[PDB]
Design a protein around this ligand. Structure first.
Ligand SMILES: Nc1ncnc2c1ncn2[C@@H]1O[C@H](COP(=O)(O)OP(=O)(O)OP(=O)(O)O)[C@@H](O)[C@H]1O
Ligand SMILES: [Mg+2]
Lengths: 240, 69, 240, 183, 222, 97, 41, 232, 49
């Protein structure tokens, strides 16, 4: 199934597939964390788990949520330094678009440009194709909320509910079963479903000090991060 | 044709699924649904039993990287 | 065979091997410990004397990046000095461009990005150093950060880098640093140094200590001679 | 979680008797959540059975706005489908479902209840849909017999009564009824 | 715009349900100047949905042949080959029910040449079967036998005739019994037609059952 | 295209495959099998009708780890105060062994 | 080889109706089935 | 940084370029696509299918308009399409700037083929893994063209590309002619694309674009849903 | 659920209209407690083994 250096660089194997991109998808799961993004009627939420193994570490600087722009929110999965570089690149691109064209950049154009940048690595053979994922959420006029996903292969798509990490398949199946019912979603309902999907996939019944929640809604499009008190209130409301 | 399948069971749903199941595991689906209905101390099989049994038996994840095409 | 000869190839399991070898090379340093007090940061390094010929104070492993920033090093020496030079240049450029002293949360990010830039291409090699940055400011408090060859920078309350990292952090844990001022913590650093590195490994060693905080009024500098001597005098009672 | 909580129920039984029906809102869950708990083998069973059966007194005894007379809600709808049979996460079954509404507390009442026809059929229909499961089957059949004998006694539409009775009985497979009764 | 089309469809369905035939013809004749104001696909689907329902309602023999002919004319004017081919098949099927000899024959002969050169083969076996039926109804055994033979031979290359299989089996059994060669074969064909036509289309299963019972009677096995 | 002295094991294998779910039905007989890597098993042996149920025994969870610790650390002659939370947090990816 | 296959399979159609002679309808059915069924694989 | 600057495609002892064959074998496993030209315009049809119900079907499009009267569809790899689309648009704009006239389809096809050829000889670069179908209508007569990873291009009358394309070509052989209409062309395109569809053919699983003497345009979901009726 | 209940109360499955399974296998990472579970089952059941 190999002929030459098709196992070592990005060239076509005799069967028509190149393995160096499939290896990054396995490299994504090295971290061991799972994140979910849900879209509602007039809001969008991101939920992620975070673990601090020891008390020596400073727990205030292990966040996996980043703020690219005052209206656009993001979350990463996989390697850390690659995600940091990608976030830096995204911030630069958003600032450049705003300066050059005089109005805020739509989320879909940003995701398309990020995928276009990340597609070159699988074309030239002198570089490694940045094995980390990308999830973006935002609000946009005339369309409402939007959630977008981008993967290292140079591919992107818009969604209504997404999960990325080690437990992608089970959470995807749960979200599909839930969304087939076609029930109208509100703020509390979206947050509750987002929390319960992770809770039932992991079977942990976690405390309010090991999750991160980010929200956006049509009353103040500013991206904001929930505090611990609000998370505790949501958790106690969830369990009757 | 031998077990109960009272009134609200839809079989055209499960036939429509792809993934080429063989002939020796459809019997396994029916057997597992019957066992699951036995567990609940009930002698009538419902649709949830078929749903759970079909979800459990097949167990194929994706193997289908989406940038093939 | 042949999946670990380049830094631009993914193994079938999905991980780069060269950075792991760099970490293994880093794992043969002596020791470097950094603890943040209520009003500053304290560094401590134990240095091995190879022979009597070398003059006292050679191979200094405790640099001065800026007027208010320290640095502690473990690993190779040449790469450490190169990183120190690039950090100095970046801090000078930031000061000249804007007009005020650079915060740690930005300098650490810049240095981490520069380090990570080398683990993508096949025309260079990963670095072989792991280092710690510390500082104090009046409007920001005390700051400590740790960076490794991979390019991952975290904040900490107390860290140890080198050979016996675990045997040192297991003793840092018993210490309670959240309250007591760092006028006596030098004694604890000395005591924690002398309780490591059994005499079978090497014949003798020397101690090096740093100082930065409100006591020094921002500036980072070496501890006074008398205070260090009292520190060894107190730490020598481990024989009981 | 047995006696002591029941002490409470026996304390507030006078309040239930004196006050009105909506107060059930505060006494339905206090035992129900206890049925959620179920840490001990026999306490949870006593509490759940007692509460479920006790709702019978309010039904029928307080005939107005109850099954005996104006069953607009109460036992017909509020406490039949929703009491425990449909869902309460998991209902313990065994003593609580057998000794409660399913058995004498309602079947006996039906014998000594309406005497009139019009809602006797609806009481029968509701108390028949709940027991369409399994490992009860010595309560659904009697009610089916009652319905058929009543329908034959008055209207005398034999074709329909025979049709309904025929499909109902598969008693060779029931396996719990005494032989002289199944024969 | 779309409200008018929805109202037209609802009115056609209501007229079909009520049990009136003149109203459907009047609506079909009235909606001609409205057709050439909408998209081609919408007009074609509307014409199909009205004509098929009116034809398949029941047998009110006074308002079908001319309507099918005018639909054929409209389709030919609009240059829609597939629609007019389907309508020609429907019309040649209709001519048999009106007991006409040559108008139901030369039309099929014309349609066969066009059908042979194109992809369609199921429509070809249907037309062959209809030709065999009309030759049989005019007391000509050899020609009906030849048409049935051609239909059977050209029906083995199709992946599946899901329902035409039963009709083909029934016609083959009828033709075989007409020559009283052997009754076991006719009985087997009738049984196969009954089995393959069961629980899908009720109206024509009882006749197959009746024919099978007659055949079994003829074997002196009551 | 295998080697000799190896097709005998295959012969035993198909004999076993015929003994269970073969031409003659078994009654009141059940079988249990265990292996810690099922990749190499024959596709015919894993077919439903022979091995109907596949059971997974994954690594313990935090609650499972605490349960195993309480089971095994009991009988020892302990003294003082013990805190299982740190032990549970530190031991990740462990086994009962 | 498929000419021989058509010849040897046309007789099965005569057998299927319990006959003693072969007519060309069997030949046509045989050739149609053989040519069509060889398309797959 | 710096590249490699040595060719990654070399001649085999039998005189064959192996990488081109591998790229073609990768193209042959893509999504099916069909293109038909009949006497009034051109029709491009393709079959798209989402893995589950979470995907949004109104986010990305298979059919893209290069300019007012040229359209283009692909078959093969996903990401490799977008850069080609962008390059084609840029080339068209350049021609419009130079000559103040809309670019003919043949010139655009020649430029795209030259780019695809130039991209398989430089240093340290693998060939493209997609194939293109281009349709246009300039100066009365319509035009349909097909590109190739090796850089060659041909002019067709009815083409099936992607997975199971030989049977599609056989089907188009026995139905196509030189005297039809746009509507019958759409009908036969849908019929021949139905040979590989799933159990159901929903409107959301088909992308259809038509170019006539009024300009290229992608059909709205309502029109495609209507067209799907009265067929099959 | 496989080896205990059907061997003692076999009329339930006949009442429902199915047949209980025959065998099963256990898999996972090494040292997760498979042979221990088998030993417990064998040591706490009154049947030929
Ligand atoms: N859940 C558990 N509770 C208590 N002890 C356990 C548990 N799981 C495993 N063990 C320990 O595992 C030890 C031996 O495990 P066992 O023989 O079952 O291994 P295994 O999982 O079958 O692995 P393998 O056969 O692949 O070597 C026992 O002595 C016991 O202490
Ligand atoms: Mg073992």
């Amino acid at each position: 199934s190999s002929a030459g250096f098709d196992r070592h660089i990005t060239i076509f194997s005799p069967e028509g597939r190149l393995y160096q991109v499939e290896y990054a998808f396995k490299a994504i799961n090295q971290g061991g964390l799972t994140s979910v993004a849900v879209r509602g009627k007039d809001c969008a939420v991101i939920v992620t788990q975070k673990k601090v193994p020891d008390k020596l570490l400073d727990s205030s600087t292990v966040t996996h949520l980043f703020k690219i722009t005052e209206n656009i929110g993001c979350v990463m999965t996989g390697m850390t330094a690659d995600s940091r570089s990608q976030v830096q690149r995204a911030r630069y691109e958003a600032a450049n678009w705003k300066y050059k064209y005089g109005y805020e950049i739509p989320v879909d154009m940003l995701c398309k440009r990020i995928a276009d940048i990340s597609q070159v690595y699988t074309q030239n053979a002198e570089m490694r194709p940045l094995g980390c994922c990308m999830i973006l959420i935002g609000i946009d006029e005339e369309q409402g909320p939007q959630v977008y996903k981008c993967d290292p292969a140079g591919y992107y798509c818009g969604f209504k509910a997404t999960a990325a990490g080690v437990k992608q398949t089970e959470s995807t199946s749960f979200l599909e079963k839930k969304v087939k019912k076609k029930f109208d979603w509100t703020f509390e309902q979206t947050v509750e479903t987002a929390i319960t999907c992770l809770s039932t996939v992991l079977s942990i019944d976690f405390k309010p000090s090991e999750i991160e929640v980010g929200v956006v809604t049509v009353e103040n499009p500013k991206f904001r991060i929930l505090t611990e008190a609000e998370i505790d209130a949501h958790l106690v409301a969830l369990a009757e | 044709s031998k077990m109960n399948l009272s009134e609200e069971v839809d079989l055209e749903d499960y036939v429509a699924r792809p993934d080429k199941i063989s002939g020796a595991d459809i019997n396994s689906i029916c057997q597992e649904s019957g066992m699951l209905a036995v567990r609940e101390n009930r002698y009538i099989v419902l649709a949830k039993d078929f749903e759970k049994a079909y979800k459990t038996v097949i167990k194929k994840d994706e193997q289908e990287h989406e940038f093939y095409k | 065979t042949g999946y670990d000869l380049s830094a631009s190839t993914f193994s079938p399991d999905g991980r780069v091997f060269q950075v792991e070898y760099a970490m293994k090379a880093v794992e043969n340093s002596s020791t470097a410990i950094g603890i943040r007090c209520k009003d500053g940061v304290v560094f401590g390094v134990e240095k091995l004397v190879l022979s009597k010929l070398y003059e006292e104070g050679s191979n200094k492993r405790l640099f001065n990046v800026d007027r208010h920033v320290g640095m502690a090093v473990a690993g190779l020496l040449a790469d450490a000095r190169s990183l120190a030079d690039i950090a100095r240049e970046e801090a000078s450029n930031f000061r000249s461009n804007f007009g005020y002293n650079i915060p740690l949360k930005h300098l650490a990010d810049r240095v981490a990005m520069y380090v990570h830039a080398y683990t993508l291409y096949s025309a260079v090699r990963p670095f072989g150093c792991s280092f710690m940055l510390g500082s104090y400011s009046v409007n920001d408090g005390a700051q400590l950060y740790m960076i490794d060859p991979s390019g991952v920078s975290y904040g900490y309350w107390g860290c140890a880098i080198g050979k016996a990292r675990q045997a040192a952090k297991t003793e840092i844990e018993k210490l309670q640093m959240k309250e007591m001022t760092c006028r006596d913590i030098v004694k604890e650093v000395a005591k924690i140094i002398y309780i490591v590195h059994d005499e079978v490994k090497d014949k003798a060693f020397e101690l090096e200590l740093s100082w930065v905080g409100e006591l020094t009024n921002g500036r980072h500098e070496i501890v006074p001679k008398d205070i260090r001597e009292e520190a060894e005098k107190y730490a020598k009672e481990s024989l009981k | 979680m047995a006696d002591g909580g029941s002490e409470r129920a026996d304390g507030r039984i006078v309040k239930m008797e004196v006050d009105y029906s909506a107060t059930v809102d505060q006494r339905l869950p206090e035992c129900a959540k206890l049925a959620k708990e179920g840490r001990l083998q026999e306490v949870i069973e006593t509490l759940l059975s007692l509460e479920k059966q006790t709702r019978t007194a309010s039904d029928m005894v307080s005939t107005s706005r109850i099954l005996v007379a104006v069953v607009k809600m109460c036992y017909e709808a509020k406490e039949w489908d929703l009491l425990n049979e449909n869902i309460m996460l998991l209902s313990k079954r065994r003593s609580q479902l057998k000794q409660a509404v399913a058995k004498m507390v309602q079947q006996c009442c039906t014998y000594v209840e309406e005497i009139t026809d019009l809602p006797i059929k609806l009481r029968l229909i509701d108390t028949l849909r709940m027991v369409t499961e399994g490992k009860i089957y010595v309560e659904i059949e009697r009610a089916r017999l009652t319905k058929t004998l009543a329908t034959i006694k008055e209207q005398n539409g034999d074709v329909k009564e025979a049709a309904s009775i025929l499909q109902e009985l598969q008693v060779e497979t029931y396996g719990s009824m005494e032989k002289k009764e199944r024969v | 715009v779309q409200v008018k089309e929805q109202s037209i469809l609802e009115l056609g369905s209501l007229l079909a349900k009520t049990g009136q035939a003149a109203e459907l013809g009047g609506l079909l004749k009235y909606v001609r100047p409205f057709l050439n104001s909408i998209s081609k696909a919408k007009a074609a689907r509307l014409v199909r949905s009205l004509l098929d329902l009116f034809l398949d309602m029941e047998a009110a023999t006074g308002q079908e042949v001319e309507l099918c002919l005018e639909c054929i004319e409209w389709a030919k004017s609009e240059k829609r080959t597939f629609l007019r081919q389907a309508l020609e098949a429907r019309l040649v099927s209709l001519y048999f029910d009106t007991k006409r000899y040559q108008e139901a024959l030369h039309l099929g002969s014309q349609l066969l040449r066009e059908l042979k050169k194109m992809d369609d083969k199921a429509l070809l076996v249907e037309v062959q079967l209809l030709e065999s039926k009309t030759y049989h109804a005019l007391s000509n055994l050899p020609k009906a036998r030849a048409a049935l033979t051609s239909a059977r031979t050209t029906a083995n290359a199709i992946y599946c005739p899901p329902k035409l299989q039963a009709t083909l089996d029934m016609q083959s059994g009828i033709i075989h019994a007409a020559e009283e060669k052997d009754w076991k074969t006719a009985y087997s064909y009738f049984y196969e037609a009954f089995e393959g036509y069961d629980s899908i289309d009720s109206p024509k299963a009882i006749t197959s059952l009746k024919y099978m019972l007659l055949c079994k009677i003829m074997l002196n096995t009551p | 295209e295998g080697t000799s002295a190896d097709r005998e094991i295959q012969r035993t294998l198909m004999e076993l495959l015929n003994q269970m779910d073969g031409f003659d039905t078994l009654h009141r007989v059940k079988m249990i099998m265990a292996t810690n890597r099922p990749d190499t098993l024959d596709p015919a042996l894993l077919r439903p009708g022979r091995l109907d149920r596949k059971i997974h025994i994954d690594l313990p969870n935090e609650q499972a780890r605490l349960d195993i610790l309480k089971i095994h650390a009991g009988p020892i002659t302990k003294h003082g105060e013990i805190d299982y939370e740190a032990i549970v947090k530190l031991s990740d990816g462990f086994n009962g062994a | 080889a498929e000419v021989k296959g058509v010849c040897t399979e046309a007789g099965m159609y005569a057998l299927r109706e319990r006959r003693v002679h072969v007519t060309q309808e069997d030949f046509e059915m045989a050739v149609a089935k053989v040519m069509q069924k060889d398309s797959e694989k | 940084e710096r590249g490699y600057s040595f060719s990654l495609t070399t001649f085999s002892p039998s005189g064959k370029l192996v990488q081109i064959e591998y790229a073609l074998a990768a193209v042959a496993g893509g999504a099916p696509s069909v293109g038909i030209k009949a006497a009034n315009g051109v029709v491009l049809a393709t079959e798209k299918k989402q893995k589950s119900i979470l995907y949004d079907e109104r986010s990305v499009h298979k059919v893209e308009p290069i300019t007012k009267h040229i359209g283009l569809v692909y078959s093969g790899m996903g990401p490799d399409y977008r850069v080609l689309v962008h390059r084609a648009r840029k080339l068209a704009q350049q021609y419009y700037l130079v000559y103040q006239e809309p670019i003919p389809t043949a010139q655009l096809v020649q430029r795209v083929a030259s780019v695809m050829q130039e991209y398989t000889q430089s240093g340290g670069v693998r060939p493209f893994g997609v194939s293109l179908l281009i349709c246009g209508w300039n100066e009365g007569r319509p035009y349909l063209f097909q590109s190739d990873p090796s850089g060659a291009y041909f002019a067709w009358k009815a083409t099936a590309m992607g997975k199971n394309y030989v049977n599609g070509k056989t089907f188009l052989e026995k139905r196509y002619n030189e005297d039809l209409e746009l509507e019958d062309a759409i009908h036969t395109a849908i019929l021949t694309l139905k040979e590989s569809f799933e159990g159901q053919m929903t409107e959301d699983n088909i992308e259809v674009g038509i170019c006539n003497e009024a300009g290229f345009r992608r059909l709205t979901p309502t029109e495609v849903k209507d067209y799907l009726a009265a067929i099959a | 659920e496989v080896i205990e209940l059907p061997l003692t109360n076999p009329e339930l499955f006949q009442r429902v209209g199915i047949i209980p399974p025959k065998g099963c296998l256990l898999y996972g990472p090494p040292g997760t407690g498979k042979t221990l579970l088998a030993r417990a089952v064998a040591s706490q059941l009154d049947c030929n083994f």
